[PDB]
């Protein structure tokens, strides 16, 4: 039987808009934003916490070749994120009654702060209300689908992979998780996956 839920953030909870993000970057003068997404790239580095938010911005400034404020950069980068529908927050709260609920996400400090400020706050609830713990690539200095991030998660949480269900819209991420004995489901873009618990 399953005791634990590993929930993905991107797509599974928060709706994403790459086109909007691209458009917002071009409107502040980063014309070729769409050509910039590399393994040594600032996007990959910040995902794994190898650089700081300050370094990321300066990275953007650098390939941008222009004066642009921190808030402007953050606003455009954050525009990639849209919303977490509130029925998914209800679902998470509802689920805590029967499972231990965790988050595992490839994300970055800038996005995470925006998410904790703007998507999770709901009624009286904040991010802490939804999860036993949040596992974030840039804090763990690793990234899905590295086999080690899954091991690192179950060991740090003290949970058995075989009693854990993983929900993530990346197939590759699910397929590696499966190797470790974790059960998985791969929701489609914008899918309401509450059907899993009926
Ligand atoms: Cl600034
Ligand atoms: Mg995702």
Considering the chains and any ligands shown, give keywords for the structure.
DNA polymerase, domain 1, five-stranded parallel beta sheet, 198 residues, binds chloride ion, alpha/beta, binds magnesium ion, hydrolase, monomer, magnesium binding site, 10 helices
Describe the 3D structure.
The protein has 198 residues and is an alpha/beta fold. The protein folds into 2 domains: 127 residues, HAD superfamily/HAD-like (Rossmann fold, 3-Layer(aba) Sandwich), CATH 3.40.50.1000; 71 residues, DNA polymerase, domain 1. The protein is built from 10 helices and 7 strands. Helix 1 packs antiparallel against helix 4. The structure holds chloride ion and magnesium ion.
Tell me briefly what this model is.
The chain has helices at 18-26, 42-47, 53-64, 70-78, 86-96, 109-118, 127-130, 137-140, 147-157, 171-179; strands at 4-7, 15-16, 81-83, 100-105, 133-136, 164-167, 183-185. The protein is α/β, with parallel strands linked by helices and 198 residues long.
């Amino acid at each position: 039987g399953i005791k634990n839920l590993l929930i993905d953030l991107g797509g599974v909870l928060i709706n994403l808009d790459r086109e909007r993000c691209i458009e917002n970057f071009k409107k502040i003068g980063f014309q070729n934003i769409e050509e910039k997404f590399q393994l040594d790239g600032i996007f990959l580095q910040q995902e794994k916490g190898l650089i700081t938010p300050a370094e990321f911005r300066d990275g953007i400034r650098e390939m941008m070749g222009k004066m642009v404020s921190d808030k402007q950069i953050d606003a455009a980068w954050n525009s990639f994120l849209v919303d977490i529908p509130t029925y998914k927050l209800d679902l998470l709260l509802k689920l805590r009654e029967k499972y231990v609920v965790y988050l595992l996400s490839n994300t970055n400090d800038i996005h995470w702060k925006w998410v904790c400020k703007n998507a999770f706050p709901y009624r009286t609830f904040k991010v802490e209300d939804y999860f036993e713990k949040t596992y974030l690539s840039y804090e763990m200095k690793m990234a899905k689908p590295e086999p080690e991030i899954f091991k690192a998660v179950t060991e740090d949480a003290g949970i058995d992979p075989k009693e854990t269900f993983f929900i993530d819209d990346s197939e590759i991420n699910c397929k590696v998780a499966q190797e470790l004995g974790i059960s998985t489901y791969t929701p489609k873009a914008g899918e309401d996956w509450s059907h899993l618990f009926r």
